[PDB]
Amino acid sequence: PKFIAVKLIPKGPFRDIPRADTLFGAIGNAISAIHGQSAVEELVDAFVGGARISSAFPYSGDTYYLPKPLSVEPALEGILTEEERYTTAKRLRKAKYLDLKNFELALRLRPFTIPEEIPYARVDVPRFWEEIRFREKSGVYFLYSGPREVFDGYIAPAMRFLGDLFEVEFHEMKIDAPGSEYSVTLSNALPTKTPVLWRLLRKRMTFIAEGSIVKNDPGGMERLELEVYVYGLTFPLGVELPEG
């Protein structure tokens, strides 16, 4: 499918790589101050109504990175054909992100390679805590899927306002994903069914990590009192699973 990729050009260093639950939490908070709640209830409804935002992923020049789908992990013994199969299979297992080209292959369980240098570095300065040092023309992006009226109406106004540590531009972006019963989440999600393959993510909520596999799971949002909404919807792209 084709998407609107919200690119964050970083005017200075970041503290986290913000995944979808914290992105929506910030987009929501901006809308509270900028338009009041009536537009937050409307922002939620648009998202329950089918609209989706991905987690934030690394930005380099004209290269877009995406999360390695967990579907490949057990099927490494399929894209081989010992040392050249022991070492790589481990560095493939460890690899967190893929290029758009290699990610599109990973969905189809075709042979793919890994990004050599990932264009961000977690510096931990003592006094302690860490920042994220970005390369030149390198930053972070997240995808939006759904109607145009909602992007121009809610998301784009919210993101410019948030930028006022970063500037914002957006492009069209096609992801050639296979047709399948199973999909990869490009967003940390709160599942409704039991998923296929996953890594758990502790925040107190228990999320399914980015790259986890689901069979027709839209995820779900949660309302609670401390009202605030926690974004746990799936950003699904079709994926081919091995037999197992």
Partner: protein, 700 residues
């Protein structure tokens, strides 16, 4: 006796006739000579059961009569029962699979072989050496020690395994050339496969247990260990978490043994939070495993949120798939490994609500007086020197000798590498206590080591007994001998290693973990720097120089948190392995990013660079070579000059500058090495910082 205990002790003594043949005591053949040992032993002390076990060493004519001679009722067994035991134990011997002096050839190096000695961590380090023929005199003294111990042993598998391990560990199961398998391992694996066939129900078969899938390979691996241990809020606590993961592991293994009616012989290994069990393929077993697996995962979720998981999977297996046919065992381990990778990608899928002074420990019920910590199944009461042991099972620490515990207690010996520098008080040293004891800059040394391509090594093993030996010896270097290497032993075998001071008598080191094929060790940064090379040399010797470590070293401020430290040395160890294997990450390093320059050093490459440069600028014990006192600034100017080579590697400025900077000292850096230009490798100047920065740290 019962049919269960008989088959267990049976397969565990089918080949106790091999040590006596080679001693040359009885008339001849080991099958015969083995019976004349147990039957003889039965008569002395007057323990009837040994004469029933003596039959295992041997048209069913004379056998049925020799069994009928012996009372099957006296003990409480059928005659038909004992025929099955013998036929079960007979086949088991086949499934676990010449001169009377050929020694045990090392699993690590089948070309080299082990000198006859009995398992003792306190004395000597097993080093595969020259093929020295074992005297018939030696085997006699062995059999005489074996005789005395077996006499006072309480004729349960839990009291019989410890004596067979002590004595028959460094003894060739068969005396062929390049024979890998230890006798003890072949004996414990047969006791395992035999008991598996009995429980499986299969009887009077001579291939219903062989060609039919009546066995289970049960494999349990912990996941999130790193997080569970190195992710908190001190070193005392860090140690307590490692110890607690050990007891949790034992609790799950012992419950599987308890409910399937198996014995510790059935445990192929339990090391690095990874355990394997051979067991029966009965609808009872698979059901009981699911109940154990489910309750274990549920307890782990309540106790530790999602931090620590236990992935338990089992593959049904035939007798065929324990050996070779044209490696079915390795392929059957590969199918099970695959099952585990999927289970680890389904963390807590077995929980549906998700998506909405002491000597050991006693394994009692959870509700019990003096329970210090609880597992998923049982509670654990500490067993002190002056105290009494409490529980069905008793986990005893760093002894195969049961000592003074009740006759009705399951003995379970567990080895743990737990060396630590004692404070001016009885308590273990802190990160500050260790960091202050360092030569020069007051920093805590953190080193994380891992054995290279162990997965490939284990995958080469044909048979259960081969894997049993491979796994045990591997685990025993880390659990048994890392304690010794720190103490200062094997000085000749190690030799000259990169060092900054004379080795202390009570070194400022603390083992966090050492077991499986890995270790995490902290202490005075300089003592840790030296221990890295000591451990690696001992490991090269312990193996036939046929296996390699990779190590990640880190030197931090004492006040640095455990999780950043653990993260850095893990990152550094991962680099060491990724930049080829068999290398050490010595220190943080600047380099060109042209993909020709590695941060890690080949052990021998670094050891050679220390030999060359260290003596010329380092006097020892924290002092700079007398000729450089007040000329130290030169070393910084060299680092300054090397940094210009880092900025652009091709420019020679460095070669000409270094020259004017000096003159004799460092003749290796003043030139332009053309072998490096040819081989497209870094110039010698690139490697110098690994030695200088360590010396500069030592001399402050």
């Amino acid at each position: 006796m019962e049919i269960d205990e008989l088959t267990a002790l049976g397969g565990l003594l089918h080949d106790i006739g091999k040590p006596v043949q080679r001693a040359g005591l009885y008339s001849g053949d080991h099958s015969t000579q083995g019976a004349r040992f147990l039957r003889d032993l039965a008569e002395n002390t007057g323990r009837a059961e040994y004469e029933l076990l003596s039959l295992f060493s041997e048209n069913d004519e004379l056998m049925i009569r020799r069994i009928k001679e012996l009372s099957p009722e006296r003990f409480g067994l059928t005659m038909e029962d004992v025929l099955n035991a013998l036929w079960i134990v007979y086949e088991a011997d086949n499934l676990a699979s010449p001169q009377a002096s050929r020694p045990l050839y090392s699993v690590f190096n089948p070309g080299k072989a082990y000198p006859w000695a009995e398992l003792d961590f306190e004395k000597e380090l097993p080093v595969p050496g020259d093929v020295f023929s074992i005297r018939s005199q030696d085997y006699r003294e062995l059999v005489k020690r074996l005789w005395e111990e077996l006499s006072k042993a309480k004729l349960r598998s839990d009291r019989l395994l410890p004596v067979l391990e002590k004595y028959l560990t460094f003894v060739s199961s068969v005396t062929s050339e390049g024979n890998i398998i230890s006798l003890y391992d072949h004996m414990r694996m047969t006791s395992a496969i035999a008991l598996a066939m009995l429980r499986a129900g299969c009887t009077a078969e001579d291939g219903r247990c062989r060609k039919e899938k009546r066995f289970l390979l049960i494999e349990g691996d912990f996941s999130g260990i790193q997080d569970f241990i190195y992710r908190v809020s001190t070193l005392k606590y860090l140690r307590a978490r490692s110890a607690y993961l050990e007891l949790i592991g034992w609790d799950v293994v012992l419950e599987i043994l308890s409910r399937l009616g198996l014995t510790r012989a059935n445990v192929v290994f339990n090391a690095g939070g990874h355990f394997m069990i051979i067991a029966q393929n009965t609808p009872d077993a698979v059901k009981e495993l699911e109940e154990i697996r489910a309750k274990a995962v549920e307890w782990l979720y309540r106790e530790f949120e999602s931090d620590l998981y236990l992935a338990i999977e089992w593959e049904p297996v035939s007798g065929r798939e324990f050996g070779r046919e044209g490696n079915l065992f390795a392929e059957a381990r590969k199918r099970l490994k695959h099952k585990l990778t999927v289970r680890k990608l389904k963390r807590f899928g077995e929980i549906k609500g998700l998506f909405e002074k002491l000597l050991g420990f006693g394994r009692t019920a959870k509700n019990d007086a003096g329970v210090l910590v609880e597992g998923p199944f049982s509670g654990f009461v500490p067993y002190l020197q002056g105290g009494r042991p409490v529980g069905e099972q008793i986990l005893v620490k760093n002894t195969l000798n049961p000592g003074e515990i009740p006759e009705s207690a399951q003995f379970v010996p567990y080895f743990v590498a737990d060396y630590f520098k004692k404070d001016p008080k009885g308590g273990v040293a802190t990160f500050e206590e260790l960091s202050m004891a360092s030569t020069g800059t007051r920093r805590l040394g953190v080193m994380k080591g891992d054995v290279d391509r162990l997965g490939e090594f284990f995958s080469s093993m044909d048979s259960p007994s081969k894997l049993a030996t491979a796994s045990r010896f591997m685990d025993y270097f880390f659990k048994g001998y890392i304690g010794a290497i720190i103490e200062g032993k094997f000085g000749y075998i190690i030799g000259d290693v990169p060092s900054l001071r004379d080795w202390p008598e009570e070194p400022d080191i603390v083992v966090v973990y050492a077991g499986g094929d890995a270790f995490f060790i902290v202490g005075a940064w300089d003592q840790i720097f030296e221990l890295a090379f000591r451990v690696r040399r001992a490991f090269n010797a312990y193996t036939g120089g046929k296996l390699t470590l990779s190590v990640g070293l880190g030197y931090f401020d004492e006040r640095t948190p455990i999780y950043r430290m653990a993260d850095v040395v893990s990152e550094r160890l991962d680099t060491a392995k990724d930049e080829g294997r068999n290398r050490v990450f010595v220190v943080g390093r600047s380099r060109p990013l042209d993909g020709k320059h590695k941060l890690s050093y080949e052990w021998n490459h670094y050891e050679e660079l220390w030999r060359t440069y260290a003596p010329r600028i380092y006097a020892g014990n924290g002092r700079l070579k007398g000729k450089l006192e007040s000329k130290k600034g030169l070393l910084w100017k060299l680092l300054e000059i090397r940094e210009l080579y880092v900025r652009d590697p091709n420019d020679v400025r460095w070669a000409y500058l270094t020259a004017y900077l000096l003159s004799d000292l460092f003749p290796e850096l003043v030139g332009i090495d053309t072998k490096a230009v040819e081989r497209k490798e870094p110039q010698p100047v690139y490697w110098v910082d690994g030695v200088l920065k360590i010396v500069l740290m030592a001399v402050r």
